Amino acid sequence: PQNDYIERHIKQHGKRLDHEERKRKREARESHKISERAQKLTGWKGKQFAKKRYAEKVSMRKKIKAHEQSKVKHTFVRRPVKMERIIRPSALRQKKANVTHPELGVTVFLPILAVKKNPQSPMYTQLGVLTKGTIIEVNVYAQVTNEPDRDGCVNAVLL
Amino acid sequence: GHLGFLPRKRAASIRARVKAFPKDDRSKPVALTSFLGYKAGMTTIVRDLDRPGSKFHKREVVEAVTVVDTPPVVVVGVVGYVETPRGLRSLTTVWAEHLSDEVKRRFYKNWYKSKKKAFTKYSAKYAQDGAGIERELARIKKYASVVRVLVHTQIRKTPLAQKKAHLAEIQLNGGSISEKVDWAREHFEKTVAVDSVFEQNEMIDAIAVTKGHGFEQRGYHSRTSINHKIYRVGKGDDEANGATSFDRTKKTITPMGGFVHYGEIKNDFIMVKGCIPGNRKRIVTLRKSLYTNTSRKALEEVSLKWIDTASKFGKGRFQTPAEKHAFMGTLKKDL
Amino acid sequence: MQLSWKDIPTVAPANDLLDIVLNRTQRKTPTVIRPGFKITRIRAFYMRKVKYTGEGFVEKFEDILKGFPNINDVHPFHRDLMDTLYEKNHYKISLAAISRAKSLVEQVARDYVRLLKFGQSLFQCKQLKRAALGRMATIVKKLRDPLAYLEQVRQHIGRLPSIDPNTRTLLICGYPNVGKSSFLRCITKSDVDVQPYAFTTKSLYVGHFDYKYLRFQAIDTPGILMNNIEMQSIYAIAHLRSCVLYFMDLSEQCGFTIEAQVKLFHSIKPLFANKSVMVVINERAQLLESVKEVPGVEIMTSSCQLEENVMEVRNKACEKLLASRTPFIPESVKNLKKYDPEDPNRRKLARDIEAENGGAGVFNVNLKDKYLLEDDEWKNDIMPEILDGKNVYDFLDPEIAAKLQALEEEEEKLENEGFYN
Amino acid sequence: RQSRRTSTKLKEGIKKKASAHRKKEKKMAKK
Amino acid sequence: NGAQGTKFRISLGLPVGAIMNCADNSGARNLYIIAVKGSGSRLNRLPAASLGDMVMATVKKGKPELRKKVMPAIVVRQAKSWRRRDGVFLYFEDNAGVIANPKGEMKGSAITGPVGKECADLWPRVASNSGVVV
RNA sequence: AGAACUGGCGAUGCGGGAUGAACCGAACGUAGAGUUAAGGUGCCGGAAUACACGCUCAUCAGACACAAAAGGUGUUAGUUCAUCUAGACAGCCGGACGGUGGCCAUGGAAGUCGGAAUCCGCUAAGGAGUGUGUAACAACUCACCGGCCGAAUGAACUA
RNA sequence: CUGUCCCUAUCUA
RNA sequence: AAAGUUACCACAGGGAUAAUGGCUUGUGGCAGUCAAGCGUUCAGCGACAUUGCUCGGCUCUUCCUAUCAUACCGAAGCAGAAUUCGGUAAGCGUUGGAUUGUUCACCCACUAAUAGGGAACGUGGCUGGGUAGACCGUCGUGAGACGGUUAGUUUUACCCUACUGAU
């Protein structure tokens, strides 16, 4: 427990007399073991193995192409006045939205100022709902492109 | 619970027939693989413990050992079993031409009203110039692959009032099946000593029907207990059977005033540590471990130090009447 | 702990940690539900799964944080040793990254659980759960570099020496390539060859030895001539309470002239002046007078190729560190020879007899043939000790024949008088 | 092991789903 | 640690919640049993200790220093009839125990009253601090 | 989901789909003979264990639109390109250079801790070096050619 | 302090 | 001078719903490049990595594996010990007492470990927390309060049967 001794011990005494042979045989068998796993593995494990193999193949293809390139050379909020028993839980209220600029490669998390025009209802605009397509204003107009009710986030693109 | 022991129904009969027998070494000398007997109460034994590793090494330990009455067993016939795809099959059987009154009664349910014509016809034909018995013996020697010997207990030599013997088959483990029947022929009408089938320190497994309990149905079921060591083997005529090398007191193992619910031991008996399925007066059959279970506990010998033989009824402060007389002394009724 | 942090749990990379957490969530918790199930039941099931995932992530992060020692909150010697090998600010930033990831995971789990209970449909609940899992994966994914760094430093810290600055100790200093480790080999169990190239030892070596029954150990250093390997030696020299031995080569080995070595020793003198220094020399010797200008430094002219003076140096270093009715004996015992373990002809002990007989669990020691007796013929004692319910031990006694004769005489004197009739 | 029996309810649901998918495919001819 | 052999299943008569006198000069008057270490968890069974067993107990009486604390305790007297290997059944005068660290070192300089043979032969340190063994 | 139109169900037996309310056939008086539909022709079950061309060996294949985008050194049939007696692929024997330890980064880096150059000189061809290791070289391997070698074969895609 | 319980067993009508 | 306007239009009037189609699980949302191929030649779309901030809690039995321990094997700076993951694996086990403003947050210990669930309104084999249908009419200033009418139905069972036993 002093230093890299295990490497030093290996150097001063050597690895197993068949360690290299075992590694070579394992590498040779890997060609068939991969196929066996792709054909034997079932359930979620098969899905994971297939996804990993596809990702590895895509990465290898991309690397080959790169080498070839070089080879040439939910709502928003005694304030209520006239609303009936349509109480909206505070959990559905979010003050900040994700705003991205189409012309700039930078995004800023900023508070939501006011809802301009919520589609699918004028009542939605009055109540400040955040359905997809709603036009809003942000403290620097932007429109929400995602569905906050299904993901809990409010993504908007500056108009 | 234990689903393996189900169904917990009544046993087929009091005599629990042995379902399996130990291995059959066809080269060893002919010998019996089981023996009959009757449970006779229980007693406490204190002995030294020669067992290395145990904390109690070189120490005395109190233990309980059961006592089974085993009068000499007499052979009356043999059974030849052939091998068939549907299991072993009995092709024929033979008898000794002479049967004790016990087995003759065993073949009748109302003996006193019976004419007692148990084997008169067979015996009459047996006394011919052979050709009837030798034929069966040769047939068994030719086809039979395993041979079992039929024996019965000497109930008339037992202090029980049953007066009826129980037939039982015993497998022969030794020499070839021809040697088996050859040895059996020399033993027809003869008796086999209890000490010939077992010896001291040998492990045995008992098989018998446990005490019944009626509706709860409970009890009265066949059970098997294995790994029971034999502590001592005695004889009815061997006076001072309860006298250990240390105690050396001329007293029989029979408790003062006799056993509880049982008579007195005046025949050969087997002493084994622990209890046995069944109760007193129940017929018990003894097997030997069903296999080579010679562990250190089995291997180690048990040198007995003292044997308890006091009055089992109630309590007891003395082992023999002499001790009681000496301690209590003379009394009014004495003189 | 404080000596060697070999107990730190392995820091699974972002992909491995995320895979483990997701597998634990999928396996332990149930995963079977139907749209026809009670809405509250589905909400509770999804919330429980999300909470289990968050708890697993929090537990992993907390274990990683607790196992790893806070460099700033560790002994100054160990703190500086870690700083030299791993940049202290970088390590602190890496730990803060894990802390921030844990805080973000907790906040995400709480926010989603608060929002999840309001799901009006199974699809909405499933989408919220998937969004929470994606947030957790993204938080874990960003930690790939800090997680890899943590795993590397964990796998490297385990093999570090268990140095004990508080204990009295001696430090082997001097120029590199001067066989400074040869002295270590011949004074302790350590094993490092001469290796005529200078920087063989990329890390400190420690070896234990005992003098006057007092515990001691020696620490080897690569040497000084501004690099990590050289830098770590400075803090070891300064913080450690050990005495420091300066090694010098009085030969062409290492190429450095005696003047250069003396000048370097003088230049580094202000750092170890209070360490009770000693100098070992592994017109040429005239310059040693200048070295001796320091009262506390001796000049051990020697050569580390053998044990010419290592034996004396071992005691000298320890001494410098410390400076900072009549009985009855049977003649048989005196005459009996000692049991030589290596001699095959030595007297066979009970161990040999037991081995020749069998294992310890099968051989039983026999007390017979050992105890003395008047006649060895009956050594196999079978003492009954019981007779007709009477204890023989209460009657065993010599010269009982006279008592029996007296009893017989009394019986005769009572019978002739007609006592019994 | 899984049952290979063709459940009547499942079979009819399969036909309904196939008809719905065919309707969507026919209505998707806008490119 | 402390043990010198395998447990022997003697009769158990000291379930959780029992109180026994502290047979030592450590100043403690009695020990309250909260759990029995090394025992088996049976359905609804209360963990039962016995002579020579190591259990965790809290000093319910004595000097304030030992009060409210929990430390391992070794039972030296059970008072319940049990079968010894030497034939005859025996039981002690009353329940008693001693307090010691998990290493078997007794807190009191000497034990008082009779000490069970089984506990003495299983805890050498207890026998070292014992003066009356059986 | 809504708007319109057309059948089935009822005011419908019967045959088949093993079993049915949406499937297929189908003009209902009681009988005899033959010819058919769907559905079938190894047995239960009346009918060829019929003929012919190909396909699958599947650690629970298979005999009826969806979790389906992919992987498999699991089979058979194909499209494109390219080499092939100037010697196809494979298997070995050799070479695998010279500036130069290219320039920076240093306790140290001769290609394989690292940053960008990745240039020129000669070749049937040989890198500022694809991988193993040495503090560092060393050696070894392919990127690439020749010697033995003797004919077809590789890469990407379709069924 | 108690069979509520560890842990149930026994007798009576 | 009044009429329209109003998706808060509120109070009454009326139309039809709302009481697995193999469901279900581990990797997000919006934004951009990278692009198997389709877009009339292919006027549009688009996989994988990449980037920006971001009603609990009781009890006996059966069964599933998505297995905490026991058995075996591979990997990991695996020096030993101990530890982490993965694969076969359900044969055998998965604890004695306390928490009661949501008790499910969560107490202190034992044990090799104290794995999650199904048993179709899953069961009371099992306990209590729970907090309390509709119709009409009267007084209704924008608003709530008093009638009256009513439903309180898986049930004993010497009914079927698995059972444990017994003729």
From Swiss-Prot, chain A:
Q: Look up and give the organism this protein is from.
A: Saccharomyces cerevisiae (strain ATCC 204508 / S288c)
Please explain the role this protein plays, according to its UniProt record. Involved in the biogenesis of the 60S ribosomal subunit. May play a part in the quality control of pre-60S particles. Under normal, rapid growth conditions, high levels of NSA2 would allow the progression of pre-60S particles through the ITS2 processing.
Question: What cellular component GO annotations does this protein have?
Answer: nucleolus; nucleus; preribosome, large subunit precursor
Q: What is its main location?
A: nucleus
Query: Per its UniProt entry, which superkingdom is the organism in?
Result: Eukaryota
Q: Keywords on this record?
A: Nucleus, Ribosome biogenesis, rRNA processing
Q: What is this protein called?
A: Ribosome biogenesis protein NSA2
- Region (Disordered) location: 1-42
Q: Where is this motif: Nuclear localization signal 2?
A: 50-57
Subcellular location field: Nucleus, Nucleolus
Subunit structure comment from the entry: Component of the pre-66S ribosomal particle. Interacts with NOP7 and RRP1. Interacts with RSA4 (via WD repeats).
Compositionally skewed regions (Basic and acidic residues) per UniProt: 1-39
Write out the similarity annotation.
Answer: Belongs to the eukaryotic ribosomal protein eS8 family. Ribosome biogenesis protein NSA2 subfamily.
Q: Where on this chain is Nuclear localization signal 1 (motif)?
A: 14-21
From Swiss-Prot, chain C:
Q: Which GO MF term does the entry hold, naming one?
A: GTPase activity
Keyword Nucleotide-binding tagged: yes
Gene Ontology cellular-component terms for this entry are: cytoplasm; nucleolus; preribosome, large subunit precursor
GO biological process terms on file: assembly of large subunit precursor of preribosome; ribosomal large subunit biogenesis; ribosomal subunit export from nucleus; rRNA processing
Give every OBG-type G domain span.
168-322
- What does the entry list as the binding residues for GTP? 174-181, 220-224
Which residue windows are transmembrane per the record?
none
Ordered alphabetically, the record's keywords are:
GTP-binding, Nucleotide-binding, Nucleus, Phosphoprotein, Ribosome biogenesis
- Does this entry carry the keyword Nucleotide-binding? yes
Primary residence: nucleus
Give the UniProt subcellular location, in the record's own words: Nucleus, Nucleolus
Q: How does it assemble?
A: Associated with nucleolar and cytoplasmic pre-60S particles. Directly interacts with RLP24.
Report the protein's function: Involved in the biogenesis of the 60S ribosomal subunit.
Query: What else does the entry mention about this protein?
Result: Present with 28000 molecules/cell in log phase SD medium.
Assigned protein family: Belongs to the TRAFAC class OBG-HflX-like GTPase superfamily. OBG GTPase family. NOG subfamily.
What is the protein's given name?
Nucleolar GTP-binding protein 1
Gene behind the chain = NOG1
Curated annotation (Swiss-Prot), chain D:
Per the record, the similarity remark reads: Belongs to the TRAFAC class YlqF/YawG GTPase family.
Q: Extra info from the record?
A: Present with 7130 molecules/cell in log phase SD medium.
Reading the lineage from the top rank, the first entry is Eukaryota
Supply the source organism for this entry. Saccharomyces cerevisiae (strain ATCC 204508 / S288c)
Compositionally skewed regions (Basic residues) per UniProt: 1-8, 16-29
The part of the entire sequence present here spans: 6 to 36 of 520
- What role is this protein assigned? GTPase required for 60S ribosomal subunit export to the cytoplasm.
Gene of origin? NUG1
- Let me see what the UniProt entry remarks about domains: In contrast to other GTP-binding proteins, this family is characterized by a circular permutation of the GTPase motifs described by a G4-G1-G3 pattern.
Localization per Swiss-Prot or TrEMBL: Nucleus
Q: What is this protein called?
A: Nuclear GTP-binding protein NUG1
From Swiss-Prot, chain E:
In terms of InterPro entries, this protein maps to:
Ribosomal_uL14 (IPR000218), Ribosomal_uL14_CS (IPR019972), Ribosomal_uL14_sf (IPR036853)
Provide this UniProt record's keywords sorted from A to Z.
Acetylation, Cytoplasm, Methylation, Ribonucleoprotein, Ribosomal protein
- Reading the lineage from the top rank, the first entry is Eukaryota
A GO biological process this protein is involved in? cytoplasmic translation
Q: How does it assemble?
A: Component of the large ribosomal subunit (LSU). Mature yeast ribosomes consist of a small (40S) and a large (60S) subunit. The 40S small subunit contains 1 molecule of ribosomal RNA (18S rRNA) and 33 different proteins (encoded by 57 genes). The large 60S subunit contains 3 rRNA molecules (25S, 5.8S and 5S rRNA) and 46 different proteins (encoded by 81 genes).
Cite any additional comment in the entry.
There are 2 genes for uL14 in yeast.
Q: What is this protein called?
A: Large ribosomal subunit protein uL14A
Q: What is the protein's species of origin?
A: Saccharomyces cerevisiae (strain ATCC 204508 / S288c) (Baker's yeast)
